[PDB]
Each structure stands twice: as C-alpha cells, then as structure tokens.
Amino acid sequence: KKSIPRITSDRLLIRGGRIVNDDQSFYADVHVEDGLIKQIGENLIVPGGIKTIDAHGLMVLPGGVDVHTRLQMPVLGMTPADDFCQGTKAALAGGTTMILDHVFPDTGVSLLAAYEQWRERADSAACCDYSLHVDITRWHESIKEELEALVKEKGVNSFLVFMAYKDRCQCSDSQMYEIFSIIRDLGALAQVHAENGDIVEEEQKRLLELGITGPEGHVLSHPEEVEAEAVYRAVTIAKQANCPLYVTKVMSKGAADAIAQAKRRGVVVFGEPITASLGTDGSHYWSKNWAKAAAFVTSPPVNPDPTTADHLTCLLSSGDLQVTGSAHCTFTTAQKAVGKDNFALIPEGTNGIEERMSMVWEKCVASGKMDENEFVAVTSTNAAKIFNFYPRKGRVAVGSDADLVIWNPKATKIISAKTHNLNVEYNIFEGVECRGAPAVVISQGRVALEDGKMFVTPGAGRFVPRKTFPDFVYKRIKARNRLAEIHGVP
Amino acid sequence: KKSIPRITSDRLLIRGGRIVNDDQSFYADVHVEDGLIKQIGENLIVPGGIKTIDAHGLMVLPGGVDVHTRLQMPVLGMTPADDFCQGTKAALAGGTTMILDHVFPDTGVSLLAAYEQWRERADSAACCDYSLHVDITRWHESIKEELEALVKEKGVNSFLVFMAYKDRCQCSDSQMYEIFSIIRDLGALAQVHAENGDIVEEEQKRLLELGITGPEGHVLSHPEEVEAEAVYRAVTIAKQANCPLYVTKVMSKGAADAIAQAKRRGVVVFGEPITASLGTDGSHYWSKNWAKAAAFVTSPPVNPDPTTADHLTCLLSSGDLQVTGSAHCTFTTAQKAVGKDNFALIPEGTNGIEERMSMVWEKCVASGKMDENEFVAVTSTNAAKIFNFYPRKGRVAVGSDADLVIWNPKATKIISAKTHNLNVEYNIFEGVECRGAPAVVISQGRVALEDGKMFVTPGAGRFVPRKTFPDFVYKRIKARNRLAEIHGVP
Amino acid sequence: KKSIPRITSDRLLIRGGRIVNDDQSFYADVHVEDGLIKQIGENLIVPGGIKTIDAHGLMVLPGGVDVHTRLQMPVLGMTPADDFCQGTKAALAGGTTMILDHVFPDTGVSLLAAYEQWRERADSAACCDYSLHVDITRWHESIKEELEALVKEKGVNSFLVFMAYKDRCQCSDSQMYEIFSIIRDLGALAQVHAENGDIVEEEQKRLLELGITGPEGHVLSHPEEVEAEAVYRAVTIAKQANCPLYVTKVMSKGAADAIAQAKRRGVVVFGEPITASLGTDGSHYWSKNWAKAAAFVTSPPVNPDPTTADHLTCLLSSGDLQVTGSAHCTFTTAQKAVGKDNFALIPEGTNGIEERMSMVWEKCVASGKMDENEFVAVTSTNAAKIFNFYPRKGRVAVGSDADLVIWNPKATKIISAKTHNLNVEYNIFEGVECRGAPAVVISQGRVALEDGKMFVTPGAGRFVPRKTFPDFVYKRIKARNRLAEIHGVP
Amino acid sequence: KKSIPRITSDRLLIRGGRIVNDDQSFYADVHVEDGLIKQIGENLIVPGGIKTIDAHGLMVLPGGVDVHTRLQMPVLGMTPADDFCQGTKAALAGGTTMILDHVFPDTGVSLLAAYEQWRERADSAACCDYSLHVDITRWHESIKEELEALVKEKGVNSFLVFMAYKDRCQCSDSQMYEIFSIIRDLGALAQVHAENGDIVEEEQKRLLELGITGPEGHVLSHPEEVEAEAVYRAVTIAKQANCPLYVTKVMSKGAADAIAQAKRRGVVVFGEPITASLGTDGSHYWSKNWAKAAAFVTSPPVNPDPTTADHLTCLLSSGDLQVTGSAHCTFTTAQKAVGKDNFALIPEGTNGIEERMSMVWEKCVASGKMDENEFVAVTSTNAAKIFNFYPRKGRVAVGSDADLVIWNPKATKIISAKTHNLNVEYNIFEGVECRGAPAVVISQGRVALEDGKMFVTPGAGRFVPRKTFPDFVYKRIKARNRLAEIHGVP
C-alpha cells in the first residue's frame, strides 16, 4: 500500500500574458504551484487539468502593495467602518494583494500589547497577506526595549512618529532626534506624520472662534505650509541623525518638493502620496452637502489647489515619490456626524484602498507621464524593497509569491459608492473615470477576482515578517556610519 | 541793549560732492545747520567763516545705520569688551552714524527694567545716535502689557524672539505664534534668532562625547540645516499670523534662500546678513591657533562653505536681503578662554561694526554686483524705512539729520587688529583688503572723522524713538488684516 | 507804459491729498505752475483765483508711464485702430500720462526715416507726453551708425531686437551678440521680443496641417516653453556681452522665472509684464465666439494657465518684474477677420493702455500683495529710472513735471467695451471688476479727466528725449567693463 | 566511430561572490559556458577541470557599459592616440566590457560610408564588445533615408546632433526640430552635443583679440552658460517634437540642473556625465605647464567651479543623471601642441575610459551618496535599457552575456600616467586616489584581467546590434503619440 500526500489546489497556469516587472516587460506563460511562481517561459510542461487563465492582450503584473492602511485604528473613540476583512476584500477587488497596516496603541496600551491585538484581529480576518507598521504615540525612557523586541522578535522594521496631535501624540524635536537615532541603530525605517501640530491647534481655535465650524474649517486649519514645514523639519532631524526617513500621506506640492530637494542633497528619504492626493482635490470641503464634505476630512487634508495631483504625478514620474498608499481609514456619515457642529470633532480618515491601482494608472500611465514598468515600481516593487520583502513581493519571478494581477489597460470604470466594496455611503472619487483595471486578481496562487466576482477567504491572509536593515535603505546609511567613524565625528 | 542768543557750531558746508541717495546720485553742495541738512544746491548762500569741506571727486552719502549691535549684552556672565562708548566710536570710524542695539534682560529682570538700564548706559556713553530693540527671553501670560508700554511710551517698535538656547530663552511654536500675533496688533516688527535649539543641543552633546572640544565643535554643532529649518519655520508661523518677520544674522545660503522663496510667495519678511557673513568664512574654526578660532565663535556661525559670501552678496543685489548689520559683540581672548576645554562655554560673539560699510562696498559695489545707490539702500535707507525713521536717517535731503559720510570709492585698506578701534586682540577680517572707505564722517552735523583722526564725544549720541506701524512694513500687513475681515477668516 | 507778459493757465492747487511716491507717502498740498510742481507743503502761499482740487481722502501720485505701446505699428499691412490720438486719450482716461511707443520701420525703411515718420504723426496727435523706442527689424553691417545717430541726436536710448518672426525680423545668436555689444557701447538698453521663431513656425505648420485654423491654433503654436527658452537665451547672450537686457511682454511663469533667476545671478535684466498678462487668461482663445477669441491674439499669447497672473503679481511684489506696460496694439473685428480661415493671418495685438493702472492696483494692491508705494514704483518710477527721465517723471517732487493722478482706492469699475475709450468692439477685460481708479488726471499741469469727462488736446503732448547711460542701468554695467579691463578679459 | 564536436573554453565558475545587480545583491556561484551565464545558485553541478575563480569577500557585477567613446574620430585632421584596440584594452583594464563609440563622417563622407569604415576598423581591433552611435554632421533633404537604413539594417538606434561647431556641423533650431521628428518616427534616440556655437565663436574671437591664447582661453570661451542654455533649448525642441533626448558630456551644474528640471516636468531626457566631470576640475587650464593644461582641452570643458563634481554626483544619486561615459578621445602632447599659439587649434579631447568605474565608485559609493546597486545602474544597467540591450548586458542573470567584474571595494589606486594603459603622456586624473577597483574582468566568458595582468585578443570584440523603440525610452513616447492623435493635435 502507498500512503499518498495531498497536493494543494493553489496552482494555475497563466498563458499569453505580457509580464510586467519594474525592470522590463516580456511575453511568457506563468505556472503557479503551492502559492509560488514555479515556472516562467514558453511551452511550459504543466499537469493536465490545471486551472488555466488566458491573459492574451493583457498584462500580468505583481499584485499591489499598499504601504499605508489604517483599518483598525481607533479615531476619537470610533472604530473604522472597513475593518481588516472588508478592507482586504476591497484591496483585492482593486488589484492590491498586500497591505501594511498601522498598529496604533490606545491610551495606556504598550506597543507590544497593541501589536498582539492587531495580529489577533488580522490573522483571523485578513483576505490577503499583510504586515504591520507600529505607531509610537508616547515617548518614554525605556521604549527602546519595546522597539528592539519588535524588530528582533515580531518581524516589524518600521515605526511612525507624530509631529501633530499636540498634547496627545506629538513629539518634540529632541525626542524625535532620540527616536530616530534608536531607529537607525535598530535598522528600522522612521516614518512621520508631518504636520506642525502647534500651528494646527492655533488655527483651529481662531477658526472655531469665528464660527467656521464646517468641514472647510478642517482644511483651513491645516494649510499646506504646516505640512511643508514639518516635512522639512523631519528631513533635517533625520539627516542629522543619519536615520532613513519615510514621509507618510504626501498631500501637497510643498511637502513633495521638500522631499525632492532633500533627495538632491543626498538625504535618505521616501515619500508616500496616497490615492486621495492623486485622485481628487479639496474643493469638496466647501460642498453644500455637509456629509460629502465630511467624507474628505483627513489629515493632512486633500489640498484645495487642483493642480496638486498633476504635480504629485510628475514627481512619481521623476522618482522623487517612490511608493503609493491609500491611508484607508473610513467612517460612516453617522460617525463623521459627531462633528456636525465642530469640524475638530469629525473623525479623520478617508477611502482609497480599492481605487489605488486604477487611479495610479489613470493619472500616471494613461496620461503618458510614466510607463507600465514604472507603474509596477510605484505600486509594489519599491515598497517591497523599502520594507524588505523583495523579491517575495513586487516581482513576477520564479520563487516569488503568486500574487498577480491580470491587468487590462483598456478597461474604463467610473468610481461610485453605488459599486464600491466599502461599508460607507460616500466615495471621495465619486464620478471619477479611470482607465486601467484588473481583470483577474490572484492571491497566494488562488483567484480572488474573476469576471467581476470576488472569491475571498477571511483569515487566509498571512503576516509577512520583515527583517531589519533592508539594503535599498541601509547600504547608504551604513556607509555614512562608517565614514563618520573614520572621520571621528557623530 | 540787545540780548543775543548763541548760535550752535553743528554747522558746515560740503562742497563739490556727488550726493548719493538710494534713488539717484547728483552733484550739489550741502549746508548743515543745527545738526540738520538746511540746503542742498549750487551757489548756496551761506555765512562766511563756516567750516568748509571740499568733497570734490568724492561721494556724500547718508551715514550707515547698523541694524544690529550687542554692545552691552551679558554672555555667560561676561560683559562685552567694546561697550557703548567704544562700539559707537568704532562705528563712526567706519562710517556708521546710527546703531540699533539689543536690550537683553538678565534673569529675573523685566523688559522695562532692562530697557531703563540700557538707556542709562547708552545715553551717557553713545558717541552717535542710537535706538533699541528689545529681546524677549521669557514668555509669560501678561507680557503683552510690557510690550504695549514699550511701543506706546518708550519708542521701541521691534522685539526679538529666540528659537535656540533650549531651557533658557527658546520659545515653542505656540508661544511664537502668540507673540507674533501680539507684535502684529501692536504694529511692531518680530525679529528672530533662527536656529533649532533642540537640534543644536543634541549635536553639541554628541560632539563633546567624542572629545571634539575645540571651536570647530561649535560650527559642527550648528550646521547650516538648523538655521535654514528654523528660518523656514519662523516664516511659516509669521505668515499664518500675518506678522511681519525680520530674520537676524543671516549666515548661510540656506537661510537666505528661504527668505528669498518666502518673498516670492508674498510673505512680509526681511533678512539681515552681517559683516561676518559677507567678509570671511568658517575655515578659521579649524585654525591651529585656538585664540584665532575662538574669535569666530558666534551663533549662527560663520559658514564653512566659502561660496557663501558671494551668494549672500548676490541676494543683497537682487533685493532679497535688504539690510546689513554687524551683530557686533566682542570678547577678549581671556574671555573666550573660559571655553578652552569646552566650545559650548566659549562666549559667543564677534566683530563687525567698524568694517560693515567698507566690507559691503568691497563685496557688492567694487565687484560690480550693485551700484552706489543700492549700497546706500542696504547700509542705511532700508533700515530707516523698516524701523520707521525715514527720511530722518538714510537720506541726504533738506530737513534730515546731518549724518553724512564723505566716501572715497578709490581708497583701499587692509583690516587688522593692529589698527582697529576695538578692545580685543583679534579681528575676524585680519588681512582682508577692502576698496572703499570713509574720508570724513559727520554725526549730528559735527565732524567725527577727518584726516584719519577721530573726534568723539561720549554721551552726545541721542536715543531715536521709533513709532509703530512703519508703512514700508505695515501697509501690506494692514491690507491683509482688512481682507481677512471682509472674507470672514483669521 | 508797462508791457505785461502773459502768465499761462497750466497752474493749479491740489489740497489735502496723500502724496504717494515710491519711497514714502505723506500729506501735503501741491502747487503746480507752468506745467511743473512748484511747491509741496502745508499753508502754501498761492495766488487767489487758482483752480483748486480737493483731494482729501484720496491719493496724489505720479502719472502712469506706459513702457510699451504700439499705436502706429503696421501689422500684416493693417494700421492699428487706436492711433496716437485715440491711444493717448485712452491712456489719460486710465491715469497714464506718458507712453513709450515702438517705432517699427516698414520694409525698405531705415530706422531714421521711421523715427521721423513717428515723430511727425505723434507730435501732432499725442494728447500726453511720449517717447520712442526703436525696433531693429533687419541687421546690416553699418547699422551701428544709425543707432549712434539715434542716441546722440534723436533722444532715443532703447532698441528692440526680435528672436521671432523667422524670415522677416528674427536675428541669429551671432547678430544678437553683435547688436547687444553695440547697444552696450552706446549706453542704450537692449529690449527683446523673446520667442523662438523657428519653433513657432514649425508648430504653426503642424497645426494648420491638422486643420486647427481657429485662434486656439495661435496659442497652441506659441507654447510657454518657446518664450521661456528665448528669454533664457537672451539673458545668456546679454550677460556674455555685459549688455543690459529688457524683456518685453512677459506673459508666462516660465519667462518671469527665468528673469528672477537671472537677477539672482547678478544679471542686469528688466521684465515687463503687461496688462493682458496680469488681467486675463488664455482660456478665451477657445471661445465659441471667433471674434472674441481673435481679440486675444497677440504674441506672446495670453497664457492658458489661469494661475499665471497671480504668479506674475507675486514677482512684481518681490521686485523681479519692475515695470508694467500695455503693449497696446488694437485691431477691429473686421481687421482680425482677415485671419478667419488661418490663425497665422490674424493681425496680432490686443488692448491694455486704459486698464493698466486699475488692473495693477486690483491685482497687486487691493489683494494685499503690495503697497501703494510699490504700486507707484511699478507704474511710473522704475520706468523713469530705467529709461532716464527720473525725477522729471515718476515723482511728486518740486521741479518735476506736473503729471499727476488723483487716485481713489475705493472706487470700483467693471471694464467693458460699452464704456472703454477705444475704437474696437471687444475688450479682453470684459466684465473684470477692478478696485482703484482715477478721480482726476493731470497732464502738463492741466486737467485731462474730471468728474468722468475727458479734456484733451491732440498735439499738446511732447516728445521727451532720453539720455544714454541711465545710472539705474549702467553703473553696474560700467563697473563690470572696468573690471574686465583690470583683469585683462572681454 | 563517434565524430566529437569541440566544446569552447569560454567557461568558468565564480564561487563565493556577492552578486550585485541594479535591483538587489545576493550570494551565489556563477557558472559561465559558451560566453553566457548558464547557472546562478549554490552547490552548482559543474564539470570538473573548469577554471575556477574564488570571489569570496568580493562583488560580482556586470561589466561596465561606456556609453560614450570617440576612439577613431578625426579632430582637426588628427587621429586619436588610443585607437579601438588600445581604447578597448584600457576599458577592460578598468572594468568596462562594452563601449559605444561615435561614428563621425569626415567631410564628403556619407553616414553609411562612415558606418562601414567604423565597422571595418572596430571588428578587427575591438578587445571587447561594442556598438556605434552615428553623428550627423550635415543636414540635407533626404538624409532620412540614411537614418532609416541605419536603424533597419545596421543595428543603430541613436544619432547625435551638434548645436556647436558653427559653419561646420552646427544645426539650426528648424533643422533640429525636423531631425528630432524623424528620429522619433524611427524609434531612435536623439543625442546632442549641447553648446551654443554662435556664442562660443564670439567669445573665442574676443579672447584671441586680447592675446589670451593659452588653454585657459578654451574654458573662457565655453562658459557654463552656453552649455546650460543649449541644453535647455534642446530639451525644449525635443519636448515639442515628442522625441526622446539624450544629453552628452554633462560637465556643469547648470546643464545637469536643466535636465533635472526637465524630468520633473515629464520630459523624456537622459543625461551623461563623464569621468572628467566627476573626477577633476577646470583649475588646470591655468597650469604653468602648457602641456598639462592642454591635456584638459575638450568641449564642453571641465568646469572651473570645483563644487561641480559633488553636484553631479548628487544628481547621479537622485536619478536625474542616469548613465556614465568617458567621451574618451585622446591626443598626445605633440598633437595638442599644434595649438601652442592658439587654443582654438588645440585638438579637443581627453581621457577617462580606464578610470570610469573606479572614479564613479570613489565619488558615489565610497562617499556614501549611493549604494552598490545604484552603482551598477549608472555604470551598465541604465545604459543597456536606454540603448536596448538589457538584459543581455547590465545584469548577472541566466542567459545574459558573461561580461563580469570581480570588484574589490577595499582596493585603492592612485591614477597616474606612469601606470595607465594609454598612448599619451598626461592623465587628467594624475594623483587622484580612488577606492574601489577591479580584481578580475571577464569578457565573453574569458578572463581579460587577473592579478594585475591583461589578456586581450584584438578583434575578439563583437558588434552588438540595437533594435529601435527600447521600451525604457519609448513607452512614454508612444503613449504621448497616441494621446496627441486622440486629442487631434501634433
């Protein structure tokens, strides 16, 4: 008698596609087995019976990597309406197969404890693979031990510091310098939420004092100048500390320019525009419909200058902005409405997880500013290299994870709350038409989207641990450490 | 019997000069009486006997206005070596006839009390006219009343805030915003000492930790980036508050560029390069001679990039930097030497009061970057318009004060401690040769310098009170206030 | 018997005004006699009977100096609809009292002959004072003698070179360098019409080839890039030749930025935005109404980017753009309509002479970007200093010409062809509302506008001759000549 | 009886190396067979006997691709001293395994005929693989047929246009636009030699007129401004034509900035700094030793501003400058000396082919500005993608050509004419010390350099034909063509 092992069904054959990686495009068939890309070539020898997808005339590209989601973060006591299960389903529907969610400790909760609560929730509800950033809401004298445990034991290599939310989680410049020096020693990436909280607080007061209580008060109290200044100050502190810097939620021309200028001076810095900053503008804060206007309330806000998106799109093309995220963090109209009488009480956050891939295509590729290969770079590959999971993600290559999008550059879709996969009533991209969309989405070698139908398994998604010292970040950083030593300076 | 009044001897006739104002140059004679310019013209009818100066082939221009001196400020317990009497003598020797000195309250001393101590000392020792800025070293809840008394009663219309000196006189961004809003309401000018004190403090520690205890540790702990960032943050807060901003001690390209960029965006901001930033560079911090190196220790430091001066000179030419000062604040070698073992204990401050006019001429006019008229602008006229004593100063015009320099554009002088009019042993411009120098200096209608000899009267110099709301500053500011009201915003 | 001379009636008393010069504002009465300002003061001793104007609550400022008009230039065989008489009347109605018109020699006509034809026409028809620029349409080997006669005998100190109009009046870079070297030696100002004619010609062909024959073809064939490039190339050649450069018709952000960057590098260059570039945008080229669209056809075109005007207004505020003109050159709808089937046959030119002062006030002063004093600078004073008739014009000062505007900052007017003083049916500012307008206009000491009525005398206007080597331009240029000699280089 | 085929000896095993590609580094062994990389992995199954190289502790990277050589170009009648054989030997000695040489037709010689002369010479003398750019020295009406034959039949996809050499090979702007439109239609890359020839010619005359006949006259007649302006004008014309642009010999900050600004506006443009612009400065033109100074004479010249190299190195780091070349074109002292009495008669050209890899490492990697992966990008990979031979070159990957450098980052070498592999007496990098050098160089799977000894076979090098429409260039270009069609514009 033979005892026969079971062979798992996360196997498929994709025929006829134009494979698009960040370095080149080429024509070949793709054989997936056990959730991995097993062969890439012509006239591939493959088992009969195998699920077969004909990708002819279409592209086969790595699944999107959303570098920023906030699917479980508490905001003014509110739980986001799209939780890990709905968020990751929405992600898959838009061609994203991996998300990086922000762990945000509630008051009194340590970083490790918050990390464990996130893992508990995500491991049982994630429809696609994921990993976690850890947000530092309070500095204290020994939190280096927490950071150290997180990077050595829990597969985390990025932490976020807040320059805003005065009297809550804002850091001082001294504290920032100290945290960035620790992050550097640990081989981790320093993220920032870059707005001057003290200035925001002063404007919010003045505005409320004059009865400007609607959502336009939110954008008015977060002028572009407080983002640009905070980014510049963060860059400055990071540069002095030789700590690699990652600027979250790049919403303005001024913030993006500061990053581009820093890069020209050799600063190790990354910028993250999000779907909202590429896809809409802040004119809607002044909408006669309060609920619509509130739907845009997020920090930094969607910039009211409608030339912003095109500018940000130019800087994705030139390599100054390297990754795209959503910062997806949604609240219903009822949730937003706690701030009906005071914009400062509106829970901040907006949509973007589902629209990211198509909006990036529409703004960048369909416009002629960038090509398909650059598109892969800024939607998966650069993210994978920055956060240290390349080429596991962000590459159609033998041995990589079978997270694949069969992409149709000729498809067009009008975004609407009528058809979106979110638990909220408004979509900040209502009525925007995008060129480019997924035809098929594959996650872990299984079809998640085909012929307009979703096939998801909440809890199938796995945690992806991330080693410290990613080369793409740290080779420069370590050379600069060694030079400082040789030259006897800090 | 007739009772005959005495006619005072502050009268003279200057013949044959090329009068140079900021708007034009022209040939005419100048008649001074009672310390004022009484007539300007050809074939002037004037009393026989009058002291007569032949200015033929030479220029007659307004006396310099040094917008920044620190002749009585205590630094680490040390009193500056050139006090009000020696400082103003040195000023007159270099063609400056008015100084604006900084009142700096010692700990426990109110602004009004410090103002009164400065007036007591300056009124009895000043060789030329003067006025006072008031430095705010501590924020408290009612200091608006002090500021208000100062501008309404004491002829002060400018106050300085520090962004550096952590744990001593550094303000937070909230406090800065609140002070700038008060300064705006009072019609006064907000000056800043623009360096990020928190970052400076962190670098100083790291450097001392590695035993870099010499004066190069001072420049190394105050990199250009902390000046540029602080200037940008100040500009940002000033702009939000609609408060006119004046950046003191512009020493770097980055700081100057930030101001130039702000001006292009319509921000009401002024920049003040000083003699040291136009005349030398920071290579001397690394001098084998400790005493020489220490002589350069001042904050912000003299920039080590030797292309800095030429850049600053370009921005004086383009109108982005509008005034020149000295920040003169000198300490002997023995005084500096308290920091022999720790650069952070070296009292900060350097020379420049005597060399300002000639160094500006040498760098700006003798190079062909600017003309004689622009030279007057950036050495007296702009200062007079900013601080609200135009055309009393900064103009050869009937009714203006007779503060006049007979200027020789062909003279050349090598600066040296061997011939300078200071009480210190080193000169940061040792061996620098400048084209352009005063032949005659007239203060209050009396000759102070002639044929290389000084004629000074300590205590002759008067306090010049300065009204609030100078048009050159505030017309824009007030229009913006009115527009905010019309548009129902802060 | 006494023989009694006649005393002329170009005398008046203006009481109660706020005098506004470029350097300061102040309250005083103004006494005009014989077309000159005779006294400025309080309690002025003046003849009884004198015409008296009460300017209380209003401003008294120098009459505008329009640095660019084209009132007699032939365009595609067409004579402009507003000739010297109508143009200068329209100018006076908008508070401009001096114009600088461009002499443009027809084919076969020498510069001197064209100059004489312009003088003949202008001397008998000008309602206000004027002077003449001379446009060089053809380079030849001995034209230096013409230029020399013009500056030595005919009171001309500015000449214009064309970089556009390929095969007609475009110069090559060699020729430009040679002309600029001659202009420098003569002490004259080199103006440019800065567009790349070769590129324009290639785009015009492509566009006509695809049947884009409407006025939008005109703007499409003159993209912003050809202006910016030509300005940069002109700046470059001027800098190498040490020849002062004046850029006419600054219509784009790119052109203005090039000038601002040049000034920062110490280049002697002036920029001239015009009413059209501050007051409207190029969206109207796409108007369904052909006649409206054609009304905007001029080169360089009105930029389609509607953020342009605000940018140009920022650069007037920062001092990078120093003068304002109209380039007024109007054609009726019938005249424009020769190009009904081919945009390249539409005669180029648009309005602006009447609206310049109010549009500059509206965009610059009423917005809070600039103050009243800066307004005088960029509307009269800087022009007077550049072209060498300061302080005869551009200053309320004793001995200056009595060209004065009693200006009402609170007046508002909607511009319309229904009320304009032009001979054409369209106004490119139709429906634009401006704050700020003249109440009274005085030219040569006589009232030209009062209570909404014009009082003009065609032929009263005089030619104003302009000496070479204006200091405001040439002091820098001559210093640089002397330095080149000292250093043994060109 | 068996008839046995011969197995060629271009086989080897490289063990223990850190493989460095532009996307990642990783540890693996490399098996080469038949001049190709056959396997990459651990525990590779390989024939016994095979030549084996132990690369432990060292890097294995793609051989350099020198995008610019001029080894056979005639200059003032002179043949370069390092011909194809010596040049390619020198290249291999410095870790470059592929060169792109410029075909330059002598007067009266067609492009095809010059191409055939280059192939004849290179095929029999090249020690490494090569390809050819074709320089267009004269525009004529039918030269499109030559260009077309070259790209369809002769494996050429890049052509160079000259903006300098007035009256010899300079193109006008019209001609440039027409050539760029043809190049675009053919799928080829437009290169430029970007200097304003008309301005250069005028300066050269002035300088010779004042007897400045030495080599400093060469740099003085080619100021940075003529490069920056010409690059901007080229960018402008390329953008209007939608033709991809490649700027050769980027020597100045101004030229590099123009390219960086263009990229930010979405222009398809590449920049090529060369060894000389990264490795030395133009102070040497003023050397007391004429022969040394003449050794630097090349166009554009080595910039006299010694901060230039660091700036260019920053822009390689930020991605604005993507490829590095040598422009190697050497002449002996005797050859240079024909210009002993007139700098304009000195044959232009300098060294760099041998030093490129080490100088790029020294300036970019050893300084901490860039990492090893970026180094591969700018020394081989980007070149391969631009000119359409990726991944055949520029990648350690199975199936790619076995052109490999075993690189030692810890080696240091002082460059000297005493040890260089050139036929000239001077080296413009004399005495420069570089970190980083080749230990072993492999070309076509054969060792060319080992233990400091060269092993070369003149004529082994092959011509590498290059298809049109490289994706890395043309995907953007073709999208923009399609958008123009959709929108009915050129």
UniProtKB/Swiss-Prot annotation, chains A, B, C, D:
It comes from the Eukaryota. InterPro entries: Amidohydro-rel, Hydantoinase/dihydroPyrase, Metal-dep_hydrolase_composite, Metal_Hydrolase, Metallo-dep_Hydrolases_sf. GO terms for cellular component: cytosol. The keyword Transferase does not apply. Pfam families: Amidohydro_1. It is found in: Cytoplasm. Keywords: Cytoplasm, Phosphoprotein. Necessary for signaling by class 3 semaphorins and subsequent remodeling of the cytoskeleton. Plays a role in axon guidance, neuronal growth cone collapse and cell migration. PANTHER family: DIHYDROPYRIMIDINASE-RELATED PROTEIN 4, HYDRANTOINASE/DIHYDROPYRIMIDINASE FAMILY MEMBER. Belongs to the metallo-dependent hydrolases superfamily. Hydantoinase/dihydropyrimidinase family. This is Dihydropyrimidinase-related protein 4.
